[PDB]
PDB file of all heavy atoms in Angstrom:
ATOM      1  N   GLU A1104       3.671  49.043  -5.848  1.00  0.00           N
ATOM      2  CA  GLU A1104       4.183  48.907  -7.208  1.00  0.00           C
ATOM      3  C   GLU A1104       3.549  47.724  -7.930  1.00  0.00           C
ATOM      4  O   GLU A1104       3.104  47.855  -9.077  1.00  0.00           O
ATOM      5  CB  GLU A1104       5.701  48.760  -7.178  1.00  0.00           C
ATOM      6  CG  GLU A1104       6.284  48.291  -8.489  1.00  0.00           C
ATOM      7  CD  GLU A1104       7.797  48.357  -8.504  1.00  0.00           C
ATOM      8  OE1 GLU A1104       8.425  47.608  -7.715  1.00  0.00           O
ATOM      9  OE2 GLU A1104       8.346  49.172  -9.294  1.00  0.00           O
ATOM     10  N   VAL A1105       3.510  46.557  -7.277  1.00  0.00           N
ATOM     11  CA  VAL A1105       2.897  45.381  -7.889  1.00  0.00           C
ATOM     12  C   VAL A1105       1.384  45.541  -7.955  1.00  0.00           C
ATOM     13  O   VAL A1105       0.746  45.118  -8.927  1.00  0.00           O
ATOM     14  CB  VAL A1105       3.311  44.105  -7.130  1.00  0.00           C
ATOM     15  CG1 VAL A1105       2.313  42.981  -7.368  1.00  0.00           C
ATOM     16  CG2 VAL A1105       4.692  43.663  -7.571  1.00  0.00           C
ATOM     17  N   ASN A1106       0.786  46.159  -6.933  1.00  0.00           N
ATOM     18  CA  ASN A1106      -0.628  46.514  -6.988  1.00  0.00           C
ATOM     19  C   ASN A1106      -0.941  47.297  -8.261  1.00  0.00           C
ATOM     20  O   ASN A1106      -1.791  46.897  -9.064  1.00  0.00           O
ATOM     21  CB  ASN A1106      -1.002  47.329  -5.749  1.00  0.00           C
ATOM     22  CG  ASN A1106      -2.479  47.254  -5.426  1.00  0.00           C
ATOM     23  OD1 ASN A1106      -3.172  46.328  -5.849  1.00  0.00           O
ATOM     24  ND2 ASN A1106      -2.972  48.230  -4.666  1.00  0.00           N
ATOM     25  N   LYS A1107      -0.231  48.408  -8.468  1.00  0.00           N
ATOM     26  CA  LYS A1107      -0.457  49.242  -9.646  1.00  0.00           C
ATOM     27  C   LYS A1107      -0.275  48.452 -10.938  1.00  0.00           C
ATOM     28  O   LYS A1107      -1.099  48.553 -11.855  1.00  0.00           O
ATOM     29  CB  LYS A1107       0.484  50.444  -9.612  1.00  0.00           C
ATOM     30  CG  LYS A1107       0.133  51.480  -8.556  1.00  0.00           C
ATOM     31  CD  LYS A1107       1.201  52.560  -8.466  1.00  0.00           C
ATOM     32  CE  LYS A1107       0.761  53.698  -7.554  1.00  0.00           C
ATOM     33  NZ  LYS A1107       1.854  54.686  -7.319  1.00  0.00           N
ATOM     34  N   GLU A1108       0.790  47.649 -11.023  1.00  0.00           N
ATOM     35  CA  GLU A1108       1.054  46.888 -12.242  1.00  0.00           C
ATOM     36  C   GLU A1108       0.005  45.803 -12.479  1.00  0.00           C
ATOM     37  O   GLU A1108      -0.253  45.434 -13.630  1.00  0.00           O
ATOM     38  CB  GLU A1108       2.455  46.275 -12.183  1.00  0.00           C
ATOM     39  CG  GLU A1108       2.907  45.622 -13.488  1.00  0.00           C
ATOM     40  CD  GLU A1108       4.192  44.835 -13.340  1.00  0.00           C
ATOM     41  OE1 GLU A1108       4.740  44.788 -12.218  1.00  0.00           O
ATOM     42  OE2 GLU A1108       4.651  44.255 -14.346  1.00  0.00           O
ATOM     43  N   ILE A1109      -0.610  45.278 -11.416  1.00  0.00           N
ATOM     44  CA  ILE A1109      -1.683  44.307 -11.606  1.00  0.00           C
ATOM     45  C   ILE A1109      -2.953  44.998 -12.091  1.00  0.00           C
ATOM     46  O   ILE A1109      -3.709  44.443 -12.896  1.00  0.00           O
ATOM     47  CB  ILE A1109      -1.930  43.513 -10.313  1.00  0.00           C
ATOM     48  CG1 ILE A1109      -0.756  42.573 -10.034  1.00  0.00           C
ATOM     49  CG2 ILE A1109      -3.214  42.713 -10.417  1.00  0.00           C
ATOM     50  CD1 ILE A1109      -0.890  41.827  -8.738  1.00  0.00           C
ATOM     51  N   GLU A1110      -3.219  46.212 -11.605  1.00  0.00           N
ATOM     52  CA  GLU A1110      -4.312  47.000 -12.170  1.00  0.00           C
ATOM     53  C   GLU A1110      -4.105  47.214 -13.663  1.00  0.00           C
ATOM     54  O   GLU A1110      -5.006  46.974 -14.474  1.00  0.00           O
ATOM     55  CB  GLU A1110      -4.418  48.350 -11.456  1.00  0.00           C
ATOM     56  CG  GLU A1110      -4.379  48.287  -9.938  1.00  0.00           C
ATOM     57  CD  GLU A1110      -5.728  47.989  -9.315  1.00  0.00           C
ATOM     58  OE1 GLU A1110      -6.690  47.733 -10.068  1.00  0.00           O
ATOM     59  OE2 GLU A1110      -5.825  48.020  -8.069  1.00  0.00           O
ATOM     60  N   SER A1111      -2.902  47.643 -14.044  1.00  0.00           N
ATOM     61  CA  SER A1111      -2.657  48.049 -15.421  1.00  0.00           C
ATOM     62  C   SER A1111      -2.621  46.851 -16.361  1.00  0.00           C
ATOM     63  O   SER A1111      -3.276  46.855 -17.411  1.00  0.00           O
ATOM     64  CB  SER A1111      -1.351  48.835 -15.499  1.00  0.00           C
ATOM     65  OG  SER A1111      -0.612  48.440 -16.634  1.00  0.00           O
ATOM     66  N   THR A1112      -1.860  45.815 -16.007  1.00  0.00           N
ATOM     67  CA  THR A1112      -1.601  44.703 -16.912  1.00  0.00           C
ATOM     68  C   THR A1112      -2.325  43.419 -16.533  1.00  0.00           C
ATOM     69  O   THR A1112      -2.185  42.422 -17.248  1.00  0.00           O
ATOM     70  CB  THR A1112      -0.094  44.415 -16.997  1.00  0.00           C
ATOM     71  OG1 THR A1112       0.378  43.932 -15.732  1.00  0.00           O
ATOM     72  CG2 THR A1112       0.678  45.672 -17.382  1.00  0.00           C
ATOM     73  N   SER A1113      -3.086  43.409 -15.438  1.00  0.00           N
ATOM     74  CA  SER A1113      -3.757  42.198 -14.952  1.00  0.00           C
ATOM     75  C   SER A1113      -2.774  41.044 -14.761  1.00  0.00           C
ATOM     76  O   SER A1113      -3.137  39.873 -14.906  1.00  0.00           O
ATOM     77  CB  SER A1113      -4.909  41.780 -15.876  1.00  0.00           C
ATOM     78  OG  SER A1113      -4.463  41.545 -17.200  1.00  0.00           O
ATOM     79  N   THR A1114      -1.527  41.380 -14.452  1.00  0.00           N
ATOM     80  CA  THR A1114      -0.460  40.439 -14.105  1.00  0.00           C
ATOM     81  C   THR A1114       0.702  41.280 -13.588  1.00  0.00           C
ATOM     82  O   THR A1114       0.565  42.495 -13.406  1.00  0.00           O
ATOM     83  CB  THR A1114      -0.060  39.561 -15.293  1.00  0.00           C
ATOM     84  OG1 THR A1114       0.930  38.608 -14.874  1.00  0.00           O
ATOM     85  CG2 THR A1114       0.501  40.408 -16.422  1.00  0.00           C
ATOM     86  N   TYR A1115       1.844  40.651 -13.339  1.00  0.00           N
ATOM     87  CA  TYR A1115       3.025  41.411 -12.947  1.00  0.00           C
ATOM     88  C   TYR A1115       4.259  40.548 -13.159  1.00  0.00           C
ATOM     89  O   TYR A1115       4.188  39.437 -13.689  1.00  0.00           O
ATOM     90  CB  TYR A1115       2.927  41.901 -11.496  1.00  0.00           C
ATOM     91  CG  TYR A1115       2.982  40.808 -10.456  1.00  0.00           C
ATOM     92  CD1 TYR A1115       4.159  40.528  -9.769  1.00  0.00           C
ATOM     93  CD2 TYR A1115       1.853  40.055 -10.152  1.00  0.00           C
ATOM     94  CE1 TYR A1115       4.207  39.509  -8.804  1.00  0.00           C
ATOM     95  CE2 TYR A1115       1.892  39.056  -9.199  1.00  0.00           C
ATOM     96  CZ  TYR A1115       3.067  38.789  -8.528  1.00  0.00           C
ATOM     97  OH  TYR A1115       3.099  37.786  -7.576  1.00  0.00           O
ATOM     98  N   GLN A1116       5.399  41.077 -12.729  1.00  0.00           N
ATOM     99  CA  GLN A1116       6.693  40.459 -12.963  1.00  0.00           C
ATOM    100  C   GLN A1116       7.487  40.448 -11.668  1.00  0.00           C
ATOM    101  O   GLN A1116       7.531  41.448 -10.947  1.00  0.00           O
ATOM    102  CB  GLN A1116       7.483  41.204 -14.060  1.00  0.00           C
ATOM    103  CG  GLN A1116       6.784  41.265 -15.411  1.00  0.00           C
ATOM    104  CD  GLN A1116       6.610  39.905 -16.055  1.00  0.00           C
ATOM    105  OE1 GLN A1116       7.482  39.033 -15.952  1.00  0.00           O
ATOM    106  NE2 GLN A1116       5.474  39.708 -16.714  1.00  0.00           N
TER     107      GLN A1116
END
Side-chain angles (χ1 to χ4, degrees):
Chain A
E1104 166 171 65
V1105 158
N1106 204 21
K1107 288 173 172 173
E1108 188 189 0
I1109 290 176
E1110 313 276 5
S1111 138
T1112 67
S1113 58
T1114 183
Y1115 68 100
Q1116 301 295 323

